[PDB]
Design a protein around this ligand. Sequence first.
Ligand SMILES: O=c1[nH]c(=O)c2nn[nH]c2[nH]1
Ligand SMILES: O=c1[nH]c(=O)c2nn[nH]c2[nH]1
Ligand SMILES: O=c1[nH]c(=O)c2nn[nH]c2[nH]1
Ligand SMILES: O=c1[nH]c(=O)c2nn[nH]c2[nH]1
Ligand SMILES: [Ar]
Ligand SMILES: [Ar]
Ligand SMILES: [Ar]
Ligand SMILES: [Ar]
Ligand SMILES: [Ar]
Ligand SMILES: [Ar]
Ligand SMILES: [Ar]
Ligand SMILES: [Ar]
Ligand code: NA
Ligand code: NA
Ligand code: NA
Ligand code: NA
Lengths: 295, 295, 295, 295
Amino acid sequence: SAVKAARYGKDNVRVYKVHKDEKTGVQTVYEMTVCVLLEGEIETSYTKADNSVIVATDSIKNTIYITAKQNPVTPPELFGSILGTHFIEKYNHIHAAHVNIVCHRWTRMDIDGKPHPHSFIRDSEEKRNVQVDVVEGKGIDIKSSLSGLTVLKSTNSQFWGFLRDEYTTLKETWDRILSTDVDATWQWKNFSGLQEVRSHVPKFDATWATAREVTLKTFAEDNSASVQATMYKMAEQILARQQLIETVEYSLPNKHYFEIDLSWHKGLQNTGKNAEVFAPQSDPNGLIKCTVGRS
Amino acid sequence: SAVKAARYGKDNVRVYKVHKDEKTGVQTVYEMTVCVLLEGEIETSYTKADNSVIVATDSIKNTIYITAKQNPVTPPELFGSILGTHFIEKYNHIHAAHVNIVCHRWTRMDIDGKPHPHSFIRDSEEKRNVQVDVVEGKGIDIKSSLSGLTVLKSTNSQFWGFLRDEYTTLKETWDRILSTDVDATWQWKNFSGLQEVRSHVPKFDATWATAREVTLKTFAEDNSASVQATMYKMAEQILARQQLIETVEYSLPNKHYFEIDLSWHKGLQNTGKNAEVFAPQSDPNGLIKCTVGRS
Amino acid sequence: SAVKAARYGKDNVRVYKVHKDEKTGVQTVYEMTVCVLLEGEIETSYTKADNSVIVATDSIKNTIYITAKQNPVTPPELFGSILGTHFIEKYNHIHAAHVNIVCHRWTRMDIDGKPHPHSFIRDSEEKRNVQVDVVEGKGIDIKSSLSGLTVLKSTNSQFWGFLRDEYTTLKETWDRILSTDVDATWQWKNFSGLQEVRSHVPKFDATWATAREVTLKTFAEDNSASVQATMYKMAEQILARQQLIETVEYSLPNKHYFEIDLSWHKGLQNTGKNAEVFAPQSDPNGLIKCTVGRS
Amino acid sequence: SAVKAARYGKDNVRVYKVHKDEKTGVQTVYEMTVCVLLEGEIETSYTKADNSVIVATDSIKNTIYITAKQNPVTPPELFGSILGTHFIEKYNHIHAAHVNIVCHRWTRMDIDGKPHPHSFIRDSEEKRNVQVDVVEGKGIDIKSSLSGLTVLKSTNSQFWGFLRDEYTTLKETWDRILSTDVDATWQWKNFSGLQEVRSHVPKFDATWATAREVTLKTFAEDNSASVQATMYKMAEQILARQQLIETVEYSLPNKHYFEIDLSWHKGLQNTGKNAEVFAPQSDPNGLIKCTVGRS
Ligand SMILES: O=c1[nH]c(=O)c2nn[nH]c2[nH]1
Ligand SMILES: O=c1[nH]c(=O)c2nn[nH]c2[nH]1
Ligand SMILES: O=c1[nH]c(=O)c2nn[nH]c2[nH]1
Ligand SMILES: O=c1[nH]c(=O)c2nn[nH]c2[nH]1
Ligand SMILES: [Ar]
Ligand SMILES: [Ar]
Ligand SMILES: [Ar]
Ligand SMILES: [Ar]
Ligand SMILES: [Ar]
Ligand SMILES: [Ar]
Ligand SMILES: [Ar]
Ligand SMILES: [Ar]
Ligand code: NA
Ligand code: NA
Ligand code: NA
Ligand code: NA
């Protein structure tokens, strides 16, 4: 046998960091879950019980904590880059670092009108994430995303004119519910190293903000021909609003809500135009993915 | 043997309902998970295979759906009452109905400044719930609650002067993080029936709003002596702001965040006054409950 | 206001312990999640910021770990008792200790026929649990249970002759699937203290074994008239097989599996006697509880 | 813009099927969760609101159910192939079908010694899975796996001689606990179509059985130099026992259990050779992956 591929490291490192403006007295907190996996000349640790090549997962956990103390942890794209550059610059036999960051929401609380200086609320389970791959002599590839953004519109969603054969039972509809959890990824042009990443830093928040803003607006205003048609509109708006983005990716569940025929009981009318009460369906669910780049 | 207690019914009924103002064109959606358990003279179904006494769980699922079409599903306290009264008035041998409702958030989206007429976002996993027990010849007891409200303050939390013996290793602190998920219950005075419930309807939202408002403010403004001291302050503020509430209950995890000594590495300083990076601890967690009523 | 009820302590303490027979070289591992909540004269910690009355949750976490080192952690009923007695005997102002233990399965692996001396497998997510309430001057109440025991029979389950009214749509069936997760609790006679608990120790495993054995057999052999009828049979068999048990409790979901009419497509026959393919329904689910004691 | 990649279909289709030997009266049940995603000339559904190209996700749900009635659902590798071939042979514009199956355990119950003819138990949350990609004019690629297989050995695991620098705090150990959840994938040689898949059918169970048997034995008998060294041994044993397997993949968390220094309290000794009580750590966790093919 032989080692064809190998990576190893530390998953699920929970990390908190506070910033104290000792002038204003305003505190900002950040919270993330971090994973770092390394590659390189580490095959012997697998084939020959040679641990001499292993930076211990424990130590990678140390490094995450250390790097966070020594550097800003915002924006995620930058922290990832700094963390991954460390591993490949520090160790000769380590040739790639793979850094996934999941960011958790701590939104400043508004109390009696006023933004409060050090109290926070998890106002969603929506996440901002990054995948940052730092390969030696290749640069830094960054996939940014927002995920777990759960939305529902009660009308202005259609689905008609799909293929009908002897497998088809679904009725054409000109008015349905559409609900999804948004998973959106945008992939940056290759950067050459930390310097280039640092030169674009303001763009990372900007593009994230844009992605979320477009997602929410297109969803609410579009008279959806299908999930397919609506997600493509979002994607092409994002690509047009930031040229450092090479591709845009959406994975979207169709979280169906079924009409309930209630007419067997007192001729009660609750379908079509009369539909008021709906059965949310835990499963199964439609799943729709698309990758959109420039023509 | 003999049947000492028995209840049965349907759990986890997912329910959606839209309201369309066909004037304005504004739609409001509601989503909940419903459980109804019945009691009465149903022992024979257990001891003698006598199914004649059983309203089928399936049918209870029907009734939930039906009741929702025939009535408003807001406020939860009212829907519960209507649903539970149905069972005990309809069936002679059914003497109590137990109705738990969990309400899901669908907050209207703000698009380009403007409230959108039919698009919604799950802007938290926080729930509003009710437990409504309708017992025949006894009235309607209602426990309302908010839950899953996750908060964190970065300072203005203390814990010193606790008992110290040969089991104690915890250091006194005059500045720590405090994070919790809020579970708050307030118990209404017994109501006599649907009429009395209907006469107070506006109070149910009001009190909920109050509970959440007090919870968030007391948490942010209080220089916490302990979780114990801070939750009692919330409870007594709620009791004072609504006389139809008999008791107030808080269950609160203490979701610890530990300091990370980083001084073994380059004499780096990250404890006490220097603390910037923290290890959120998934487990274990402190748990603190209190029931507070009037003196 | 005033404190009506109060308890506090530590939840979700994960605990592992190995036993090494240094004779045979056979190791036995145990793993549990532990919660201890205390009561007593602790109101002032809530009303007056008086922390002097508080055994710190941290210290309760210490005590769990310590008690486990100093004592056997099997059987759960005994460990609970020892742990809870500690708190009420140690502290004057602590008058009750509430101890929930959840036990995790580590079943010895069979390798090449032979029981292996120190390798284990989680061969189910089924748990053995205890609730042990130690109240000062009142003794020790113990609720033992098994839970998360998930079963399914493909036939020999019936449900006919239930009430039919204008809410009923469910068809009578003389052959259906029955699936559930078993939650079974048996409540011991009050014990006077640790001595009495120690005098019965062998009974705790025995009764657990019995409960599981009866549960599985009655489920498999009974031609079920209903969940109601089948669970009562289990309960009365357990009560008859151990006189130190005062009551037996079952909570059981009915995890429905629906027939799929496939006759719209090539007159394919998949209902009634022809039924081969079924839709497992995540929700909603029937829920059936019973408490059975002696006549 | 333009569509770079696109797939769509139905996720989380829950499926049950019983087999009745009407001779013996022995029933066998099967339960799985199924996902089918299609590709082809479907870009217009995204760019031009052209639904004419879409086989509705609903219909794909039908097809899963239908295919299951018309064919055996065991072994998973075969069902996948049949299901995926259907889509690409049926529709001109559909050029690839992607079929993930997750299999759920229903192990026949042993009652009073005897295998019971129609009663079953979920005796683990361990799954057997397949990923079957059917691409038109390319054949059938199959990734089989077992997952969620959770194991722990109490000794005979070592970790020493890893790199030590100014990031390292972890102590070398010649005796620790090793716990993991096993995720093992083995990738078959490309098959040309359904015929070739059918010609190897007996091998699929065999290889699965082998994978699990090797996994469990190597884990229990190996004096682990590291997770790395132990997983490679498993992989090379599997490759040697089946030549139709091209590569073998392991993803493995290191689910750490920490020693508890209890010496601050009554000089109690619970470290090194004395260690009996351990803190299972929910997070973070070491993660170790390897892909092993033939030299
Ligand atoms: O928007 C939709 N896209 C689809 O592909 C689909 N299939 N069924 N329903 C659907 N709705
Ligand atoms: O606020 C707190 N209350 C407690 O009871 C406690 N115990 N440890 N830490 C604590 N913090
Ligand atoms: O066993 C059953 N008990 C019930 O109470 C019931 N209700 N619907 N189906 C049922 N099956
Ligand atoms: O088996 C192990 N492999 C590793 O790579 C490692 N790192 N810390 N501990 C470890 N144990
Ligand atoms: Ar952070
Ligand atoms: Ar969409
Ligand atoms: Ar509703
Ligand atoms: Ar609090
Ligand atoms: Ar234990
Ligand atoms: Ar049952
Ligand atoms: Ar199946
Ligand atoms: Ar391993
Ligand atoms: Na390097
Ligand atoms: Na009645
Ligand atoms: Na006491
Ligand atoms: Na095709």
